[model samples]
Target chain A: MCLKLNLLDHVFANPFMNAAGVLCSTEEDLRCMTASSSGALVSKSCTSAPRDGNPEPRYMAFPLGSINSMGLPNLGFDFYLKYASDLHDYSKKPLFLSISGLSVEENVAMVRRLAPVAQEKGVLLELNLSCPNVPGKPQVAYDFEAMRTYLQQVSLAYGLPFGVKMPPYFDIAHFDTAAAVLNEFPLVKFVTCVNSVGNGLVIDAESESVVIKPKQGFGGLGGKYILPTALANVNAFYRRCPDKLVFGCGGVYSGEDAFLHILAGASMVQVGTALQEEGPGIFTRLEDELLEIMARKGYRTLEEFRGRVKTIE
Target chain B: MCLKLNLLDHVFANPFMNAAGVLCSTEEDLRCMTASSSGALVSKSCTSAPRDGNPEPRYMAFPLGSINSMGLPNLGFDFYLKYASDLHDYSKKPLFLSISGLSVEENVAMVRRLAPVAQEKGVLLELNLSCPNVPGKPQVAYDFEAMRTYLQQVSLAYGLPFGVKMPPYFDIAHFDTAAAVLNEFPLVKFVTCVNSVGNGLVIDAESESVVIKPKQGFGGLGGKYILPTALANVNAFYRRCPDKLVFGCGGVYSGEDAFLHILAGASMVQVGTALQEEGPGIFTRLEDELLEIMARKGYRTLEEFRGRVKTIE
Candidate 1:
């Protein structure tokens, strides 16, 4: 069973990869990913300057999933960019640089600086439009007008094909409007269909208090808690943006979950909560599980069933 | 520890009850709820006429949650009205009549028929503005204008204090607009914060097929899968609507879940998927668990912690 996928002019040996912000914040983490079974790797979402993020106890994992309000903790744009410059030779798998600037101006400036590196080394860009952990900063994708303006300015500054990471949209009207905005820019060649189910609060009953110390224990949720939502978002954008590739992120813990994501029209499946819980070793297990499922079903290539999820007759 | 709460001029012995469309569809189910430990009960969402709903295999429960596209099946508005008429004499607990008409006119017609019973017997109304399983019907709460129109028309027809059961809203702006619409009609004295995270599609990879037989297997989600979302919506409206009460629904399975809901500003907590799985016995378990939590914390009543969830420092 071949799991290969070609998207954004880069070949993914397999669709499995780490969702940005999960075990991707440091040089050591990035190195671990490159040497592991992951098909590709993405850097931690970076701001224009270094950030310490939210206070401790900012992340917690419960039985079904996890919640975090890390507040975009990263080593700044320069650190990730420097790492990306040597990534092409250091590893054969594609490298993605994720940027979550605090403002439109900050986003434009980072894109301008990354343009040269992107063209020269084939490094991809994924502008995160929905980081919900930052205390005072609201998610960009939720504000359609602001989203369009940011995309317009960033597309001009970067001058290359790129993608965006978005938050989940439960309403059909939102799916329509968000897709319409993405379709406005042809330069937006790919889209990741979810960062996390944002603004989710997980409370620990014993303490009679919220879990996580950021925004009063409000944070982004990840893992199995959002599998259905993640799949819906992936399929929603996949149907809306036929010209743009869709990457599935959230709630993939096993081969079956990954298969579900692919069947929902995702070209690449990102491992987040599972990756954080299992570490990079999850890549090999996920790929093996996917291959086993494929073999049992008599599928020779992912293209055979990818996005072929049947509707009720 | 007391779980009692007073909302909408009705006293709840405890804040836990069954959400609409669970085990409340038939005479037998309603009898079971009245006999159970539930503090209150809601009828299945009904139309002007009886509905058979979608085809079989319309629901599936996995490890974390359940999904269904039942297509608004019910015995009809007349049946529920008959049930409501005798409810006050049948049980001391409150009874909620949930109406989900096919159109605005149908909603108004039902309200007109029930207004007398409501005024005389205190049969509460929960206008379900967001039943996602209806084949051709879009969710009303997602469209603020449509929601306002319905609330306006229904408020005019009923001339009583009632509420609307809503779909989850993820965006801050949406919460603002939705709360604003509810605020416009002072008669909309209470609001149920969510129906379900709408249009969620769940796939069983072993069969490589959609699990349900309606609307391409798209349906409302429930159980632990949506606890965070349920809490978010409850808190979102609680923060925005000072003039109204909020009933928390979605992802409620345990007393801890119920406690979290109350802390997030819900005067009542409604159980759906878990209730369906465990039956009415879940109410007693939930209340017992919630009381244990409260006693441990030295809180005598729900109001001691209600809407008191602390923010991060």
Candidate 2:
């Protein structure tokens, strides 16, 4: 589906832009885009305030894969609020203020500041519980106790609907832990299922070393490979917590792939990597393909087969 | 994991080798390496006899994808047998002959003629039932009825073991039809799971027209995108018919991916697109990675956990 956007200053911009861990851009950078167009914007993952993400050259590309080590770079919550006023004028597309913290207090503090800003701008606040770019840190979303505390604190602070973003873990059983915690916080309106597959790397034979030096040999692997895995995880999460709103992201390249995510269990699908390859035109292509598939399959609306899996019998 | 080659001459001489539907080298041009270092060489998707494949500029490359219409050119069965003796002397690796036919009798007849030479030289026979390069025709392997009849005839005509190579289809319900036919024939031992994704094309945005002027708009999309899909299909076949052997082919560039294929139920993994990018050295690198993964995973043999899927209780 196409991203809804309001043109500003003759430029088109997507409301939602993923902060590439510690790569480039910031919440201010997002606010600047709002000057050009109004759309939902997600800030970079943050831990309390700002932390120096991973070292330089955090991005590397192989023939069909890539790795990044943007060590979760972000401006701290106190610093981010300095630019929160800029978001006032760009309130057309609901702004999604993203916040990440090392502990529940830090996360709560970040959300507390953004809660009012979100209310003022009519935007939503997104909680980044886990980020792959951060080294040695276990994902807060996957930990039962950590998520419980984090959710409890954030739920208490932010009256607005706050969504938690998670990473795709190898273990499916841990999903139960996440479900249990989310069940406790009814205010958590939606769960964004998955960030990226982490610590994935490719070495260069010619250099006899890692492709991107300085950073460790591991980074996130995005693109087509992650699609099926992400779909499976989202489907599992939906099966367990049928009432919880789920947003699916990862390896969504075309409308067919996007539709697959919705069928597997996603209220909405996020298009990211496909844009990297095909540029902004991807949205149009996806829309065309989605419409064609829908017409051919006799799907009248998204609700027709949402979370519907064919029975083999 | 590395292709154990006894001599460098064999490697240097047979550079334009054909593997399934893909051509490694152009006619009179060397530098093509097949999946196996030694096997009966098959011309790239030859027809009943000699046919010129698609014209020049048959290949195109995008940032993360490539398309080709290499029109399945070949010197038919007659010419293949003529050079069978020479091909045997050319390499110490076990020679395997590959043949393609449109109809059941034509396929059986081609095998009948080549079987004597293959048997005498101790070369195996590989039947190319599914090829995308041919125009206006569905590859024989995708049609369950045709594949069964073709395999039956070829098996009866030649007492030696033969391999049936196929392409990946969305619905593998044909697995039952194939399994039933394969059960009836003891000589058909291994099934090679893929040809290309089949005739596809891409359009150039600049020109607002078709970029590669092929009958189809896209060629097979090979690379990381197809790996998991290929593995799933291979594993499905393996589970349905445990007695039948499977060779996983598609988008395998590293040892880890190869090992994944093996774990998902592939006796042997074929390296094609990687060879296109990294040259013959690709095989060595992949082999090394396979060994490393095997050692780290604490597996003594490939047989361990082959086709094992981690399912949550």
Candidate 3:
């Protein structure tokens, strides 16, 4: 069995990859994704300037999942530039630089400066519109007009084909509306659906208290708490954005979860809390598991059932 | 051993009410809730004009939960009106009449016509702004400006204290924005956190088929799939809207789920997919389950930990 898959213009060796905001916060973590059996890598969302993020206990893991309010902490754009300039020990995986702008102006500025550097290193840009940990910034994607305008500006500024990472939208109409927006951007080649069920409050019953520190213990939720929501986002976008590819994220602790996303129309999948729960070594286990399921189901390629989630009338 | 609680000057015998849309689609279903151990009953959401909902197999139950595209199928406003007009079996419990409007104009019109009749029958009104299965209508709550206008118009038309039923919001900024919108309306007395996690496709791997039939096998997902998201919404709104009451309405299949919701700031909990899966008899079991957990936790009253989801810094 093989996990080979095509995303945009390139082919991924397998579908296993890291979701942004997970093990992608540092130079070391980026190396982990590149060195692992993973097919691709994504970076911690970075703003134009450096940020320290929320105070301690900003992240935690439970028996079921994890939550965090890291607030887009990064060493800044130039920091990544210095490191990823030598980043192509590749022949291994494709790199994705995720940007979460504080404003449309900032978004254009970041892209204008980094797009050249990113292009030189063969890096892909994933515009993250759902960075919820930013205290006062509502994800641009949730506001239709705002999202449309942001995409219009960013596309012009970057002059590149990029992917978009969005928060899970539960309304079907939003799928239609958001797709219409994405469709308008011909430069948008892929849609990565779902970026944590944000602003969730996890209480430690014994103390009757919240687990995280920032935003009064409010943060985004990931893992077992989100498999269904993640799939919903993936499939919703899959059905709506016929012209663009869609990737899956959330609730992937095992191989079955990865298979489920593929059947729902995802070309590949990203791991978040599961990696935090297990480790980067989880990619090997997931790859083996996915292959095992595919073999059991009498399939050799992801194409056999990709986007084949059947609908009954 | 008493489970009495107060809401808007009236008292409920317990917190085990059926979440709207599960079993309250008809007179028979409404009667069943009244006869059960529930503290209150809610009418199926009715529009100004009747609707037929979507196609067959529109609903189905699974081992862990259930899915539906029942699209707002009810006998119509007048149908529920005739029964709820004299709906008092007050010795048993209070009731709620749910309304989902396709337009702001219709929203006010229905509330105008129903509020008086509902009041005489001891029915509280729950305005549902998060009906995901409605083919083209965006969950009103997702569009803040539209939601505010609808609420302002409907509040004036109804001229009574009614509750707002909303979809889960993932962004803290959204929580802040939405809560700010809700705070603008004084008549908005209570808030129900969550309708289902909508637009989910439940695919069966072997048959590679979707579970429901309406809108091409798309529907709202309820049951174990949504507990954490539901709890987050409940706690988010509860903490944000301090003056108003918060209710939990997803992922409650057992006493532990109910206890978890209560600890996260829900004044009461409603059962949805669980009720559909286990029938009204599940209420008695939930009551037993909740009581046992409360006892083990060393609590005698629900208020002790209501809205007490603590955060550790």
Candidate 4:
């Protein structure tokens, strides 16, 4: 069972990788990810300045999934950039540097800095357009005009191909608007299907309290709770953005989850809550499991079934 | 132990009820619902003409939830009206008649006929503005202009207090738009928090087949899968539609689900998947479970904690 596939103009050992914000915030964490069997790795989304995130107990895992409002905690863009630059010899896997700037100018500045490095060595740049945890900051992707402005600035500032991380969109019109906006920019090569279902509140029935301690326990949701939603966004964008590839995220905990994501048209699958829960060892386990599934199904390559999900025609 | 509440100028013995399209489609089903422990009952959403709905395997229940594209199968407007008219002597629970017409004119016609009956004896009317199952038809609520138009026509035709069933709104702007529209019509006395997270597709990995048999297996989702989305919509509308009461629906299986809905500001809660899965007896079990929770918490009424969910302030 060969799971190898090509994306971002490079060969990925498999479609599995760690989603940003999970076990990729610190040096030790990034090193662990580098040693893991995942085909690629993404650094935690970073800002221009280093800072602490939300208060303690800002994330909670439940039976269904997890919720968090970590607020983009990181060691600043320079720290991750240093890692990305050093990763040239340190790791064989692809490095996707995710940046979530606080302002359009900030994003443009970061893009400008990353452009030359991206061209020199194949570093993947993923703009985080939909960070829901930041207080008082609305998701840029939710506003089409603002999104367009951001995209325009980044496209001009960085003359290299890059992708974007997106929030899950439920309505049809939103899918249309976001897709159309992405399609207009030829430099945008890929899109991450979703960040998380934002602003979800989960209460502990036993304690009669909100689960997480951030923003009154209002945070983005992940895990099994969002599988259907994740697939919907992935498939929706896959159908709409014919010019670009899609990275599927949200609700991936097992081999089946990864399989479903591929079936839904994800060029790559990113693991978040599950990776945070199970650790780096989960990569090999998922790979083995997916291989087992592929063996039984008589499929030799990912493309044989990828995006070929049959509709009830 | 007292779970009764007052809404729509009538007394509800409890906040629990069956969501429309669950087990209230036929005469026997309505009779069973009427005999159950639910405080209120809603008939299946009816059209001007009867419908047979989608084909076999149109509904499926998974561990997390259920999905269905029943496509508004009902015995027509007159059949439900007959049940509603005779319900005066048959049961004590409030009867909420749900109508999902194929067109605006059809809806207005039904409302015209039901208006006089509503004045004589209290009957709650719920206009289902979101039905995702009907092929080629867009959800009316998703389009703000069309939703406003429907409300204006209904308000003029009925000249009485009623409510509209809503689809889940994920975006903040959408919530603002929908609540603003609903608020413009004072006679729209209530709003059902959601119908379902529409257009969700569930696939069986083992069979690699879409679960349901309608619209290529794309359908509305119910049960635990939508609890978070349901709560978000409920609380959003509860906060936005200050003058209108909220009827919470989606993912109410256990007493905790009901409690959470009430705590999220719902005046009433509707059961769907679990009720269908476990049967009408589940209503009594939920009532008992809720009472136990309330008793342990030392609460005598639903209002004390209704809409009092604490924020992370």
Which residue pairs come into collision in candidate 4? A216-B312, A312-B216
Off by over 4 Å in 3: A6-9, A131-137, B48-51, B86-88, B104-110, B131-137
What TM-score, to 2 decimal places, does chain A of model 1 have?
A: 0.96
What lDDT score goes with residue B11 in model 1? 86
DockQ ranking, high to low: 3, 1, 4, 2
DockQ of each: 0.50, 0.03, 0.60, 0.41
Candidates 1 and 3 compared: the better one by TM-score is 1
**What TM-score would each prediction reach against the true structure?**
0.93, 0.50, 0.92, 0.93
List the global CA lDDT of all models: 0.86, 0.57, 0.83, 0.85
Q: Report the poorest 10 consecutive residues by lDDT, candidate 1 chain A.
A: A130-139
Question: Which digits, one per residue and each the tens of the lDDT, describe model 1 over residues A1-313?
Answer: 5677777778888998899999899999888888888889999999999999989888888778899988889999999999988644434699999999978899999999999999988889999997432343347887788899999999999999999999888777778889999999999998998788877778766665788886777778899899998888888888889988899998999998999999999998999888889888898889999999999999988889988887767
lDDT of 1 by residue, B1-313 (tens): 5777777788889888899999999999998888889999999999999999989888888778899888888999889999988644434699999999877889999999999999988999999998433343357777667788898899999999998898887666667778888889999888897788877889878777778888677777888889998888898889889888888998888788888898899998899999999888998899899889888889999889889877655
In Å, residue B111's CA in model 3 sits off its true spot by: 3.5
iRMSD per prediction, in order: 2.9, 16.0, 2.1, 3.1
RMSD of each: 2.8, 14.7, 2.8, 2.6
Better model by lDDT: candidate 3 vs candidate 4:
4
In the range B1-313, model 3's lDDT, one tens digit per residue, is 8678997888998887999987898878988999999888888988878889887889887765677888788888888777777654777888888888777787788888888776676678899987432346677788787888888898889998889988888776788899999999999999999887777767676677777787767777788767767888898888789999898998898888888889888887999998888899998999898889888888899998787766664
